[PDB]
Amino acid sequence: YQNANYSAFYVSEPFSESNLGANSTHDFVYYNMLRMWKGEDNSFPFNDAHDKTYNVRDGSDWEKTLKPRLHTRLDNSKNIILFLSSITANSRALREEMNYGIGTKGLPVIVIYPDYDKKSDIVDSNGNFKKQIKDLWDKLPAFRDNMSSVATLHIPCTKSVIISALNNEDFMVNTMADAEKYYYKP
């Protein structure tokens, strides 16, 4: 029960996943990457909170329809998979996913950085997060300002690394590690 992974990312709105080109549009492309890995290999450790339809950006009415949908899907989830990239920009729904999912629920977050493919892109040799990463947090204040309360894992975008993250109990709410920002050491 409540075993899903909740994918959170930016797209310019309104966005429908059924329009031609949806699967080519940043940052939806990275969510679809997870879906395709799972569809191709059932061992991939991803259970999509949005499996029935990705309709959390599609224009629906905030109060009556969209916000309740965000909350319901987050309530079915053990963690958030957040994609942060150079194009992550303002979005009411994405903000609410952070405030409710982290601030209210205390869900841990696996943060995938699709612009980067090396561990050394995330942290410097003293284990400080690089400015290029901190700058992405500033693009989503509701992530930045809630992340202190949960375990977060900050990773480059490579399949084997994503699998390792998703197989780690430390980043699942019922088994969460102590709140800190974690990373794989370069």
mmCIF file of C-alpha atoms in Angstrom:
data_model
loop_
_atom_site.group_PDB
_atom_site.id
_atom_site.type_symbol
_atom_site.label_atom_id
_atom_site.label_comp_id
_atom_site.label_asym_id
_atom_site.label_seq_id
_atom_site.Cartn_x
_atom_site.Cartn_y
_atom_site.Cartn_z
ATOM 1 C CA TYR A 1 0.000 0.000 0.000
ATOM 2 C CA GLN A 2 1.287 3.588 -0.635
ATOM 3 C CA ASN A 3 4.230 2.235 -2.587
ATOM 4 C CA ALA A 4 4.317 4.608 -5.589
ATOM 5 C CA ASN A 5 7.051 6.904 -6.754
ATOM 6 C CA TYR A 6 5.707 10.399 -7.461
ATOM 7 C CA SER A 7 7.421 12.107 -10.417
ATOM 8 C CA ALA A 8 7.612 15.890 -10.178
ATOM 9 C CA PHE A 9 9.039 18.144 -12.905
ATOM 10 C CA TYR A 10 8.424 21.321 -14.868
ATOM 11 C CA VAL A 11 6.523 21.745 -18.083
ATOM 12 C CA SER A 12 5.013 24.985 -19.439
ATOM 13 C CA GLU A 13 1.270 24.711 -18.860
ATOM 14 C CA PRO A 14 -1.350 23.702 -19.717
ATOM 15 C CA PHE A 15 0.200 20.435 -20.814
ATOM 16 C CA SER A 16 -1.486 17.260 -22.116
ATOM 17 C CA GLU A 17 0.474 14.072 -22.472
ATOM 18 C CA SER A 18 -1.666 13.021 -25.440
ATOM 19 C CA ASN A 19 -0.612 15.836 -27.769
ATOM 20 C CA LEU A 20 1.906 14.978 -30.438
ATOM 21 C CA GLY A 21 5.362 16.050 -29.196
ATOM 22 C CA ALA A 22 4.536 15.595 -25.483
ATOM 23 C CA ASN A 23 7.160 12.891 -25.236
ATOM 24 C CA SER A 24 9.734 15.272 -26.791
ATOM 25 C CA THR A 25 9.035 18.165 -24.419
ATOM 26 C CA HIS A 26 11.283 19.080 -21.524
ATOM 27 C CA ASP A 27 11.044 18.078 -18.713
ATOM 28 C CA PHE A 28 8.275 15.550 -19.421
ATOM 29 C CA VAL A 29 10.779 13.659 -21.586
ATOM 30 C CA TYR A 30 12.600 12.539 -18.406
ATOM 31 C CA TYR A 31 9.433 11.260 -16.772
ATOM 32 C CA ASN A 32 8.620 9.402 -19.964
ATOM 33 C CA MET A 33 12.147 7.943 -19.845
ATOM 34 C CA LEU A 34 11.182 6.288 -16.513
ATOM 35 C CA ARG A 35 7.903 5.032 -17.954
ATOM 36 C CA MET A 36 9.632 3.543 -20.953
ATOM 37 C CA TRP A 37 12.286 1.834 -18.807
ATOM 38 C CA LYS A 38 9.513 0.258 -16.697
ATOM 39 C CA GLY A 39 7.448 -0.732 -19.719
ATOM 40 C CA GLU A 40 10.437 -2.411 -21.304
ATOM 41 C CA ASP A 41 11.702 -4.153 -18.130
ATOM 42 C CA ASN A 42 9.374 -4.992 -15.321
ATOM 43 C CA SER A 43 12.334 -5.261 -12.886
ATOM 44 C CA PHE A 44 12.882 -1.471 -13.144
ATOM 45 C CA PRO A 45 12.108 -0.164 -9.629
ATOM 46 C CA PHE A 46 9.473 2.434 -10.597
ATOM 47 C CA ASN A 47 5.816 2.332 -9.727
ATOM 48 C CA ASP A 48 4.260 5.358 -11.289
ATOM 49 C CA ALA A 49 1.927 7.369 -9.023
ATOM 50 C CA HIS A 50 0.500 8.841 -12.300
ATOM 51 C CA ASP A 51 0.043 5.443 -14.043
ATOM 52 C CA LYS A 52 -3.583 5.960 -15.123
ATOM 53 C CA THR A 53 -2.840 9.311 -16.851
ATOM 54 C CA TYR A 54 -0.305 12.173 -16.430
ATOM 55 C CA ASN A 55 -2.963 14.837 -15.939
ATOM 56 C CA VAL A 56 -1.444 16.971 -13.202
ATOM 57 C CA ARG A 57 -0.482 19.834 -15.547
ATOM 58 C CA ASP A 58 -3.400 19.729 -18.051
ATOM 59 C CA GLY A 59 -5.376 22.856 -17.175
ATOM 60 C CA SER A 60 -7.840 21.419 -14.653
ATOM 61 C CA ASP A 61 -9.435 23.717 -12.063
ATOM 62 C CA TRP A 62 -6.949 24.298 -9.080
ATOM 63 C CA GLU A 63 -9.460 23.991 -6.262
ATOM 64 C CA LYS A 64 -12.006 21.514 -7.447
ATOM 65 C CA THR A 65 -9.854 19.200 -9.483
ATOM 66 C CA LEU A 66 -6.070 19.702 -9.733
ATOM 67 C CA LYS A 67 -4.951 20.200 -6.125
ATOM 68 C CA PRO A 68 -7.019 17.208 -4.895
ATOM 69 C CA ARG A 69 -5.442 15.093 -7.616
ATOM 70 C CA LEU A 70 -1.926 16.102 -6.507
ATOM 71 C CA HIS A 71 -2.694 15.292 -2.903
ATOM 72 C CA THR A 72 -4.360 11.966 -3.656
ATOM 73 C CA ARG A 73 -1.397 10.745 -5.753
ATOM 74 C CA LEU A 74 1.159 11.979 -3.223
ATOM 75 C CA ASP A 75 -0.803 10.107 -0.537
ATOM 76 C CA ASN A 76 -0.248 6.925 -2.573
ATOM 77 C CA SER A 77 3.514 7.553 -2.732
ATOM 78 C CA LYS A 78 6.571 6.629 -0.634
ATOM 79 C CA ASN A 79 8.854 9.205 -2.275
ATOM 80 C CA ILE A 80 9.161 11.926 -4.869
ATOM 81 C CA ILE A 81 11.374 11.714 -7.945
ATOM 82 C CA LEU A 82 12.133 15.356 -8.766
ATOM 83 C CA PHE A 83 13.760 16.383 -12.028
ATOM 84 C CA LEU A 84 15.577 19.742 -11.795
ATOM 85 C CA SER A 85 17.079 21.237 -14.930
ATOM 86 C CA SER A 86 18.133 24.547 -16.403
ATOM 87 C CA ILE A 87 14.580 25.068 -17.727
ATOM 88 C CA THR A 88 12.711 24.347 -14.438
ATOM 89 C CA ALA A 89 10.529 27.517 -14.025
ATOM 90 C CA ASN A 90 7.434 28.756 -12.097
ATOM 91 C CA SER A 91 4.532 26.354 -11.821
ATOM 92 C CA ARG A 92 1.716 26.317 -9.306
ATOM 93 C CA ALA A 93 1.265 22.541 -9.467
ATOM 94 C CA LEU A 94 4.984 21.790 -9.103
ATOM 95 C CA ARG A 95 5.136 24.131 -6.083
ATOM 96 C CA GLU A 96 2.211 22.366 -4.452
ATOM 97 C CA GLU A 97 3.821 18.962 -5.036
ATOM 98 C CA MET A 98 6.774 20.231 -2.973
ATOM 99 C CA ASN A 99 4.750 21.959 -0.242
ATOM 100 C CA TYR A 100 2.312 19.078 0.270
ATOM 101 C CA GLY A 101 4.648 16.209 -0.595
ATOM 102 C CA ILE A 102 7.603 17.445 1.467
ATOM 103 C CA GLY A 103 6.209 20.092 3.833
ATOM 104 C CA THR A 104 3.061 18.227 4.843
ATOM 105 C CA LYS A 105 3.882 14.552 4.220
ATOM 106 C CA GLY A 106 7.603 14.504 4.797
ATOM 107 C CA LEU A 107 8.288 12.380 1.728
ATOM 108 C CA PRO A 108 11.970 11.873 0.869
ATOM 109 C CA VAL A 109 13.128 13.047 -2.550
ATOM 110 C CA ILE A 110 15.413 11.533 -5.196
ATOM 111 C CA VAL A 111 16.550 14.540 -7.232
ATOM 112 C CA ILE A 112 17.681 13.671 -10.732
ATOM 113 C CA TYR A 113 19.625 16.350 -12.646
ATOM 114 C CA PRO A 114 19.137 15.604 -16.372
ATOM 115 C CA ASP A 115 21.731 18.180 -17.477
ATOM 116 C CA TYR A 116 24.487 16.104 -15.754
ATOM 117 C CA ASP A 117 25.867 12.615 -16.101
ATOM 118 C CA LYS A 118 28.769 12.624 -13.614
ATOM 119 C CA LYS A 119 28.888 12.415 -9.812
ATOM 120 C CA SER A 120 31.426 15.218 -9.962
ATOM 121 C CA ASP A 121 28.770 17.515 -11.466
ATOM 122 C CA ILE A 122 26.797 17.465 -8.187
ATOM 123 C CA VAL A 123 29.372 18.143 -5.446
ATOM 124 C CA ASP A 124 32.945 19.519 -5.172
ATOM 125 C CA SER A 125 35.855 17.541 -3.654
ATOM 126 C CA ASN A 126 34.908 18.721 -0.081
ATOM 127 C CA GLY A 127 31.337 17.431 -0.467
ATOM 128 C CA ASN A 128 29.753 20.842 -0.949
ATOM 129 C CA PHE A 129 26.996 21.091 -3.466
ATOM 130 C CA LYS A 130 28.150 22.971 -6.496
ATOM 131 C CA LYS A 131 26.765 26.419 -7.235
ATOM 132 C CA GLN A 132 25.255 25.080 -10.476
ATOM 133 C CA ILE A 133 23.125 22.709 -8.367
ATOM 134 C CA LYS A 134 22.237 25.271 -5.679
ATOM 135 C CA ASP A 135 21.123 27.599 -8.481
ATOM 136 C CA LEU A 136 18.596 24.968 -9.602
ATOM 137 C CA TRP A 137 17.148 24.792 -6.074
ATOM 138 C CA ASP A 138 16.562 28.547 -6.272
ATOM 139 C CA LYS A 139 14.371 27.894 -9.350
ATOM 140 C CA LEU A 140 11.942 25.947 -7.136
ATOM 141 C CA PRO A 141 11.761 27.694 -3.744
ATOM 142 C CA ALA A 142 9.204 25.262 -2.375
ATOM 143 C CA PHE A 143 11.768 22.474 -2.873
ATOM 144 C CA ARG A 144 14.679 24.515 -1.495
ATOM 145 C CA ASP A 145 12.771 25.705 1.532
ATOM 146 C CA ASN A 146 11.278 22.319 2.479
ATOM 147 C CA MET A 147 14.182 19.971 1.643
ATOM 148 C CA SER A 148 15.805 20.373 5.103
ATOM 149 C CA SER A 149 13.046 18.344 6.706
ATOM 150 C CA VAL A 150 13.570 15.103 4.713
ATOM 151 C CA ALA A 151 16.275 12.841 3.339
ATOM 152 C CA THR A 152 17.185 13.909 -0.201
ATOM 153 C CA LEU A 153 19.428 12.080 -2.667
ATOM 154 C CA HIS A 154 20.985 14.155 -5.445
ATOM 155 C CA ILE A 155 22.111 12.231 -8.516
ATOM 156 C CA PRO A 156 23.209 12.479 -12.146
ATOM 157 C CA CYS A 157 20.923 11.134 -14.827
ATOM 158 C CA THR A 158 22.173 7.600 -15.610
ATOM 159 C CA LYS A 159 20.054 4.462 -15.572
ATOM 160 C CA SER A 160 22.217 2.365 -13.220
ATOM 161 C CA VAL A 161 22.503 5.229 -10.716
ATOM 162 C CA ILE A 162 18.742 5.851 -10.822
ATOM 163 C CA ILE A 163 18.165 2.140 -10.178
ATOM 164 C CA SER A 164 20.506 2.207 -7.165
ATOM 165 C CA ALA A 165 18.644 5.237 -5.773
ATOM 166 C CA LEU A 166 15.238 3.645 -6.277
ATOM 167 C CA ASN A 167 16.362 0.425 -4.562
ATOM 168 C CA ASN A 168 17.547 2.288 -1.437
ATOM 169 C CA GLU A 169 15.196 2.143 1.558
ATOM 170 C CA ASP A 170 16.791 5.242 3.013
ATOM 171 C CA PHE A 171 14.765 7.291 0.463
ATOM 172 C CA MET A 172 11.379 5.689 1.118
ATOM 173 C CA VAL A 173 9.200 7.428 3.728
ATOM 174 C CA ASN A 174 8.547 4.458 6.056
ATOM 175 C CA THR A 175 12.267 3.644 6.205
ATOM 176 C CA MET A 176 13.684 7.147 5.717
ATOM 177 C CA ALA A 177 17.218 8.005 6.750
ATOM 178 C CA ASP A 178 17.963 11.055 8.824
ATOM 179 C CA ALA A 179 17.151 14.357 7.078
ATOM 180 C CA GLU A 180 20.225 15.550 5.172
ATOM 181 C CA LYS A 181 21.231 16.132 1.550
ATOM 182 C CA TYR A 182 22.995 13.002 0.311
ATOM 183 C CA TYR A 183 24.989 12.266 -2.821
ATOM 184 C CA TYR A 184 27.237 9.588 -4.286
ATOM 185 C CA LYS A 185 30.844 10.617 -3.636
ATOM 186 C CA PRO A 186 32.884 11.358 -6.777
#
